[PDB]
Design a protein around this ligand. Structure first.
Ligand SMILES: CO[C@H]1/C=C/O[C@@]2(C)Oc3c(C)c(O)c4c(O)c(c(/C=N/N5CCN(C)CC5)c(O)c4c3C2=O)NC(=O)/C(C)=C\C=C\[C@H](C)[C@H](O)[C@@H](C)[C@@H](O)[C@@H](C)[C@H](OC(C)=O)[C@@H]1C
Ligand SMILES: CO[C@H]1/C=C/O[C@@]2(C)Oc3c(C)c(O)c4c(O)c(c(/C=N/N5CCN(C)CC5)c(O)c4c3C2=O)NC(=O)/C(C)=C\C=C\[C@H](C)[C@H](O)[C@@H](C)[C@@H](O)[C@@H](C)[C@H](OC(C)=O)[C@@H]1C
Ligand SMILES: Cc1cc2nc3c(=O)[nH]c(=O)nc-3n(C[C@H](O)[C@H](O)[C@H](O)COP(=O)(O)OP(=O)(O)OC[C@H]3O[C@@H](n4cnc5c(N)ncnc54)[C@H](O)[C@@H]3O)c2cc1C
Ligand SMILES: Cc1cc2nc3c(=O)[nH]c(=O)nc-3n(C[C@H](O)[C@H](O)[C@H](O)COP(=O)(O)OP(=O)(O)OC[C@H]3O[C@@H](n4cnc5c(N)ncnc54)[C@H](O)[C@@H]3O)c2cc1C
Lengths: 473, 473
């Protein structure tokens, strides 16, 4: 029997598939497209995702396929420098196109034994006390214990579950086009800089083969929501830039709206949602793929614990509880960034103010910690300030913390010489290293790297172990 | 002959009148209303104005008539605490009603010998190479050397000069009403707090005689711009608060718009503009009266120098040059604050972000330094960071710096034991005090307290003296 079916083999589904396979969960990914999508949305990973890749031994291959940037501009285009003191060992943006990210994640899930089935479109579902059935559009059916809808912003699974998707509708649309041009790049660049004085929803990024990615505001809102024609792209370039640059030969035409919507329940019985299936928002700040990877990283070890039979009874519900608030904050911060890009005089004045404020290092750091997700803190109810936050990478006596996390178990980082995870050692590794560079006596880490407990008293540690790791054996 | 006619005896005109009388300028204020206005707009003075009053020996009487506050909320209502480290010796808001401010300024101008003429409405003007004629609406005429329009936001003088008043039109109107209510104050307070969760353009402030000042958004924009009726106030209270509180017996009804307009030229020959006559904007942050007092404080000693015959040829033009940019920044910051009060979801998201940022002390300080005008810096072209800024009050060996400024002359604060203002001592006092708590060798202060020069070399000091103080005698 299949343990988990994943509907959708985008970055979220593929990441989830890898996390599940770490625990020997039998995982089948049903991806509707017969061949990988060739057009990239995402342009890169942010620090929390880069950390996550390094905790799973994937960072070397991501670095080998991308370029590291430390530049300003990630929060609503607000120019700065990169913050000097961001609290991560991975303080950069990894520019890497989404197609490449999906290739790396695909090759990793496949090598861990996930079964990826392309050309398989989930059309229907049926669940009961014991499992879930997925019905494919070709009439075939698959049974598993759980089903996770990782099937993007127009998720079939979300619709079939009848999960509400409340939020703000699209009010502002933007065109995206991969096109050739008929002006020299220096001419394109000169005009773009003049426009971007005021309209920051505009630009042109070379693909390095003579094509350019043009971003240009739409005129109004479209009834269809269909992709724009070349004719509409030209009208929009004329309106914003005063020229269409002789654009021709499009190889991709797209439109995106600024709606911010969040699934009301991430879990419905044995079916969950993750990634764009659970939340949509503007690309301002480059956050969605990152958010989805982190959804998968939250969910995977929990679902694995439930399949393994040791998950405490509330564990799976803690996926919604922790991740739904996080997405709500991304959605809000993208509403704020879109307002900072508005040409209306009030917003332009607020933008000038924000430009003054981001010269303060605390502000610049705050906005980038927000964007890059390194300061996410779940409410795991304790006082100690580290509890609920992920722990950054730190040097050990030999090596580093993230090197020890590649199995995806919990980890007790113990500097006291005195604690013990006996009873849970099959689920929690004991990293007994007084030399570790972390100024607490000990920290219990969940498999997602978030701190569940900080302290130095064995009895207290025994009290917190079952919450995340179930019963002693 | 009259030296200066001031059109308008509001706070700006009255302050200007006092500054001029310090120098024996013959000053006549033509105020159109026969009796003082009884309704207050302004609720208080900000730190730069409080400093200015203390440099002119008026602070004791302002403090005796007002209440000192150190509370958050002055930038778009963003709750904080008052910033701990604001760079002023006068770190507070002086709550004092505008009527009282005008009384104090009137009694001060009158005691210095300004001639205030109430019931005198400027209707027309005529200037030539030698002077200006003001024509009053009763057909009488007065001649002076200069005329300053201090005649408010619908300035007659600005209109007669044909000075453009460009900017953003009113898009958002607010009602103001001094009314009695028919609910207990605790009920009023409870509803206002519920509304102010989201609508911060709403409130109710007791006058202490059973009347309340109610602030409530208008519905739309009015064609007349006329004062609202009680009926319109009720409609607006119902819409915003769900109740009109039984408001009755209005003693004042007003409406104000959010237009931001700035006179294109502060000076037209022998006629200048100051105060609301030169700029209008929202009351967000409580800045207009303050800005006007500071306009007068910039202009007065300069006009006095021109009347006295020693002003360098560019001096009077430096009023426009210095003060026009300052007003432009107030106008912009009020556009930003109004946006932060908008109920639209984008602005609400930007407001939540700003609420996070103002917890950083640098941000809170930055916004309050902006509001209170203490960080205004004129471009007087040097490098030294103090040049162009006002100098805060500082302790002397005995006493304090602001105690020595009450004559309204320049002031060389010299710690070196070696400098000299000989040649200019009738215009610049030499405060030779190595014990003064200021970490520069010496600072030359203009009569408005702004630093013209910092250094320690007599020859260099001689080079900068004529720019502000004319030729040696
Ligand atoms: C024309 O593109 C602009 C559109 C704005 O408008 C607007 C509304 O639409 C956007 C589109 C269509 C995006 O795809 C996008 C995006 O992918 C992204 C971020 C993140 N912030 C974004 O905000 C946006 C974005 C917007 O905010 N992700 C990233 O930036 C990541 C994860 C890595 C990037 C690495 C390098 C450092 C950059 O790529 C440099 C070389 C530039 O290429 C960009 C900074 C563009 O600047 C210029 C001048 O070209 C900018 C995306
Ligand atoms: C209902 O009044 C509100 C309207 C907002 O809306 C809005 C758009 O319309 C406003 C009107 C009509 C004002 O007159 C005004 C104002 O005079 C002012 C500031 C400055 N900021 C303002 O922003 C505003 C203002 C606005 O921003 N000046 C001051 O505050 C000064 C120089 C001193 C005040 C001293 C004390 C400390 C305060 O008076 C305390 C006791 C409260 O009374 C206020 C903080 C009000 O808060 C409440 C809850 O009542 C607030 C003015
Ligand atoms: C213009 C733009 C730029 C962006 N830039 C960035 C960025 O720089 N950084 C960032 O982090 N994010 C970025 N994003 C957001 C990012 O692209 C998405 O958040 C990311 O694709 C979400 O991945 P996902 O796996 O959840 O969903 P998707 O990538 O949509 O994948 C869903 C998968 O489901 C398959 N599927 C759909 N229906 C079914 C079905 N019924 N059965 C089976 N399979 C199905 C689809 O074929 C697809 O492969 C950007 C978005 C836009 C529009
Ligand atoms: C609701 C509200 C609240 C505010 N709160 C604050 C605050 O807390 N702090 C702050 O600093 N500012 C505040 N302001 C702004 C403040 O009231 C004004 O900036 C201030 O009144 C400007 O003074 P002024 O002397 O330039 O003009 P005004 O006070 O308008 O005075 C102009 C004078 O000119 C006279 N006049 C007009 N035409 C003629 C003519 N032809 N001949 C002769 N005389 C004439 C008028 O009678 C009047 O006395 C607020 C404004 C509003 C609407």
């Amino acid at each position: 029997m299949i343990d988990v079916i994943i509907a959708g083999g985008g970055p979220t589904g593929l990441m989830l598939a890898g996390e599940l396979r770490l625990h020997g969960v039998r995982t089948v990914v049903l991806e509707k497209e017969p061949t990988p999508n060739q057009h990239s949305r995402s342009r890169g990973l942010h620090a929390r995702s880069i950390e996550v890749m390094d905790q799973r031994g994937l960072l070397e291959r991501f670095l080998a396929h991308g370029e590291q940037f430390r530049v300003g501009g990630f929060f609503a285009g607000l120019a700065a420098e990169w913050p000097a003191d961001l609290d991560t060992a991975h303080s950069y943006v990894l520019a890497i196109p989404q197609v490449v990210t999906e290739r790396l994640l695909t090759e990793h899930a496949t090598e861990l034994g996930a079964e990826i089935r392309r050309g398989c479109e989930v059309a229907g579902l049926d669940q009961d006390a014991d499992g879930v059935t997925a019905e494919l559009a070709d009439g075939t059916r698959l049974r598993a214990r759980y089903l996770v809808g990782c099937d993007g912003g127009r998720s079939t699974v979300r619709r079939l579950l009848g999960v509400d998707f409340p939020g703000e509708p699209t009010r502002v649309e933007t065109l995206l086009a991969d096109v050739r041009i008929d002006v020299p790049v220096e001419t394109l660049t000169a005009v773009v800089a003049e426009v971007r004085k005021t309209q920051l929803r505009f630009g042109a990024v070379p693909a390095g083969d003579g094509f350019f990615r043009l971003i240009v505001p739409a005129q109004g809102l479209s009834a269809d929501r269909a992709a724009p024609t070349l004719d509409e792209l030209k009208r929009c370039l004329h309106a914003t830039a005063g020229t269409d640059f002789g654009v021709h030969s499009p190889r991709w035409l797209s439109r995106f709206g600024d709606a911010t919507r969040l699934a009301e329940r991430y879990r419905t019985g044995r079916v969950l949602l993750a990634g764009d299936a659970a939340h949509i928002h503007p690309p301002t700040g480059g956050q969605g793929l990152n958010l989805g990877i982190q959804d998968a990283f939250n969910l995977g070890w929990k679902l694995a614990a439930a399949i393994g039979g040791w998950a405490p009874p509330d564990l799976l519900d803690s996926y919604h509880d922790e991740r739904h608030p996080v997405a709500a904050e991304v959605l809000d911060n993208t509403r704020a960034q879109m307002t900072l890009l508005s040409l209306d005089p009030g917003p332009r004045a607020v933008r000038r103010l924000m430009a003054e404020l981001v010269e303060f290092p605390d502000v610049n750091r705050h906005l980038i910690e927000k964007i890059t997700a390194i300061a996410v803190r779940y409410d795991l109810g304790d006082g100690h300030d580290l509890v609920g936050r992920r722990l950054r990478d730190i040097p050990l006596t030999e090596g580093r913390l993230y090197e020890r996390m590649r199995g995806g178990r919990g980890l007790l980082l113990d500097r006291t010489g005195r604690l013990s995870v006996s009873g849970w050692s099959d689920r929690v590794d004991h990293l007994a290293d007084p030399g570790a560079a972390l100024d607490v006596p000990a920290a219990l880490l969940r498999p997602d790297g978030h701190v569940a407990w900080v302290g130095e008293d064995q009895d207290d540690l025994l009290a917190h172990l079952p919450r995340w790791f179930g019963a002693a054996t």
